[PDB]
Symmetry: C2
C-alpha cells in the first residue's frame, strides 16, 4: 500500500509564477488592506506575462515586483522580457464566486500533515537552505522531490525518496549524490523512520537548463503541492495571487483551521471538511464533515462542536484569521499548510479548548 | 445531513477556452504527425490570449489560426482579441515516464456513466443549456456559464439539495423567460436521472452577468482540473490534461487508471474503486500503485489487486497503444469532463476488460 506526494523548489517555473502572484498581492496589502487582487502569471521560456484584475490605492510596479523574485534565483535583466496585461484601478462579504474547498488534518506528524507531504517539503527546504549557505555548491533553485511511503504495516516505511536538482555544467557527480543521500537520510532520521529506502537522484541525467527556460510555468498549477499531496480532496481553486475575499483561498484556510483544531483536540485522527459557496451568500451554501471512522467521540458531537466553536460568516472568519494583514509570499513555496517554520493564523491551535467544551467535553 | 457538491463550466468559461485551444493545437499536431510531442499552455487575460509551450512535430500548424477556430464559434470576431504565440515549434524502444508525479483513477456505480451523481448533473445541465443556445431553443444567452450541484446522501436514496447556475445573458434579456427556461432545464435533468424535483434552484445569484469570457477576467490552461476529473469525490495528483500528447504520463496514466477503476466497478468487484499511480523519470512502469475501494469490495481487496495486475499491462508504451491515445481527439474532452462521457467514444470508458477481470 504506497501513498506518494511531491514538492518543488523556489526555482520551479510554476512556483516562480505563484511567488510573483503572491508578491504582487503582498505589495498591494502592505499599502491598502482593501486591495482586490486576482493576479495570474505565465512564464514561457524567456517571456513572463503578468495578468489579472487589481483594485488598490497602492503604488505597485508589477514588473519591478516580478524582478525582485527572479533576481535572487538568480537571473539578471538579460534573461527575461517581463510585461503586464494587469487592469489596475482605484475606488458583509458574500461569496464572490461559486465553488468547493476542503480542509484536511491528520495526526501522523507534529505539523498535523500527511508524512509524504512533510518529507517532500522538508527535503527541498534543507537543500535550498544549503544552496544559500553554500553548504551544497554547484546547484540552482529549480528542484523537485517525490516521497513514496508504504502504509501496509502499523508502522510506516519510507519506500522511495526521489529528487531532481538543477546543477552547474562543471559539477562533481559523486559530491552531488553524497550530499543528496545524506540530506535524504538526515530527513528520515529526524521524523524518525527507516534509513534503507531506495534513493532516486537526478534520474533525468543532466539537469543544467531549468526554470522557465526550456519550459512553461503558470500560477496555480501546483495546487496539490500547495495543499495535502493529495491525501486530501481538492475543489480545483489555486491560492496564489488572490486577496482574502476570493473564498477559494480564505475558506481553504478556514477549513484547515477547523480540521487541524479537531485532530489537535483528539476528537479524531483524521478530519476532512468540504465547504461550497454561491455568488452573494455570506455563509457556505453546503458543509460536509468526514473523519474516516477515526472519531474518538460521536461523529454527531463533532458536527455540533464545529458549528458551535466557529463563526461561518466569511467576513468574520477572514478577520478572525487576520488574512488582511498576512504575508502570502512565505506560503508560495513548500505548501500552505503544516508550516511550523512560519506563524500562520490558520495553523494556530487556539480553538481546541472551545472544541472540547462544545463537544459536551 | 450529509452534502457532497461538484461544479462544471461551459465552453465560454475563460479557463475552458484555454483548455480548448491547448487540446485543439494538440489535435492539429496529431492529425498530421502521431509522434508529435506537445506541451501547449494558454493564457487569456482580458483581450490578450498568449499561446505558449514546447512542440516537436512535422505538422504544418498555425497556433493563432487554431485559437480563432475555437473562439469564433463562441460569438467573438477578429475585433475582440490580440492572439500571439511564444510556442517553441520544431522537428526531429520503451516509453519511460518523461516526468515524476502522481495520478488517480476513480469509478462508482451511482450513474450509468460510472461517475459521481453531482458531476454528471452539473455537466448534463450545462450540456443541455449549450445545446439550446446553439439550436436557439434558449435565445438571449452566451456560452460562458457555471453549474454547482449539491446532493444529500443521508438516506438510502440520494436527494438533490441545490442546483445552482450562472449563465452569461444579453443586456436586453427577458428575466422571466430566463428563469422559466433554466428552472425547466434543472427539472428536465433531475427527471432524466429520476431524482426529486423540489430541490432549491439558485439562478444567476450575482444579478447581471453580461460581460463574460476572458473580458475583464483571466483564463489559464489546466485551472479546472477537478471539473476535468471527479468533482472532488476522487483524489487528484495536480496534473492538468489539456495541451499534452500521450507521453506526458500525467494524462495517459489518468486515463489508464480510469479504465481500470471503471472496469472493476462494472465487473461488480466493488461499488467504488480508486487507483493511485506514481512515476519516476526513466521508469517504463509506474514507480508505485495503491488500490482503494472504501470498504465497498464484494470480494477480497487482495483478489482485486491480483485481477488488476493480471488483466492490465502497466508498460506505459503498451497501455498508450492499447487505448489508441495517438489516434484520439482530445478537444471533445476539453469541456464537460474527461470521464463518464456516454456522449463520446473514449477508449478508457470502454467496458472491454470486465470478462478478463472476472476470470483473474
Amino acid at each position: 500500500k504506497i501513498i506518494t506526494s511531491e514538492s518543488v523548489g523556489a526555482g520551479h517555473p510554476d512556483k516562480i509564477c505563484d511567488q510573483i502572484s503572491d508578491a504582487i498581492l503582498d505589495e498591494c496589502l502592505s499599502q491598502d488592506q482593501n486591495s482586490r487582487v486576482a493576479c495570474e502569471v505565465l512564464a514561457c521560456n524567456r517571456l513572463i506575462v503578468i495578468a489579472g484584475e487589481i483594485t488598490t490605492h497602492a503604488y505597485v510596479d508589477v514588473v519591478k515586483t516580478a524582478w525582485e523574485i527572479i533576481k535572487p534565483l538568480g537571473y539578471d535583466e538579460n534573461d527575461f522580457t517581463i510585461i503586464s496585461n494587469v487592469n489596475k484601478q482605484s475606488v458583509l462579504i458574500g461569496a464572490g464566486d461559486q465553488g468547493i474547498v476542503f480542509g484536511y488534518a491528520c495526526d501522523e506528524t507534529p505539523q498535523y500533515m500527511p508524512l509524504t507531504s512533510v518529507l517532500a517539503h522538508e527535503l527541498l527546504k534543507e537543500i535550498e537552505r544549503q544552496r544559500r549557505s553554500k553548504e551544497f555548491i554547484k546547484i540552482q533553485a529549480d528542484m523537485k522531490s517525490q516521497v513514496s511511503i508504504d502504509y501496509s504495516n502499523s508502522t510506516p516505511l519510507i519506500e522511495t525518496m526521489l529528487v531532481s536538482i538543477q546543477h552547474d555544467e562543471d559539477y562533481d557527480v559523486e559530491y552531488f549524490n553524497k550530499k543528496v543521500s545524506a540530506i535524504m537520510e538526515q530527513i528520515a532520521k529526524k521524523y524518525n523512520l527507516n534509513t534503507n529506502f531506495k534513493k532516486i537522484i537526478n534520474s533525468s541525467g543532466r539537469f543544467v537548463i531549468g526554470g522557465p527556460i526550456g519550459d512553461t510555468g503558470l500560477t496555480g498549477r501546483k495546487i496539490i503541492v500547495d495543499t495535502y499531496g493529495g491525501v486530501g480532496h481538492h475543489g480545483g481553486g489555486a491560492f496564489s495571487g488572490k486577496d482574502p475575499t476570493k473564498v477559494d483561498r480564505s475558506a481553504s484556510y478556514f477549513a484547515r483551521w477547523i480540521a487541524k483544531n479537531v485532530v489537535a483536540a483528539k476528537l479524531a485522527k483524521q478530519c476532512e471538511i468540504q465547504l461550497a459557496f454561491a455568488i452573494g451568500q455570506p455563509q457556505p451554501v453546503a458543509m460536509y464533515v468526514n473523519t474516516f471512522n477515526t472519531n474518538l467521540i460521536d461523529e454527531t458531537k463533532i458536527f455540533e462542536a464545529i458549528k458551535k466553536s466557529f463563526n461561518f460568516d466569511i467576513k468574520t472568519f477572514i478577520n478572525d484569521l487576520n488574512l488582511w494583514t498576512t504575508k502570502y509570499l512565505p506560503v508560495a513555496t513548500y505548501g500552505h499548510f503544516g508550516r511550523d517554520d512560519l506563524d500562520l493564523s490558520w495553523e494556530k491551535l487556539n480553538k481546541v479548548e472551545d472544541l472540547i467544551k462544545n463537544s459536551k467535553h
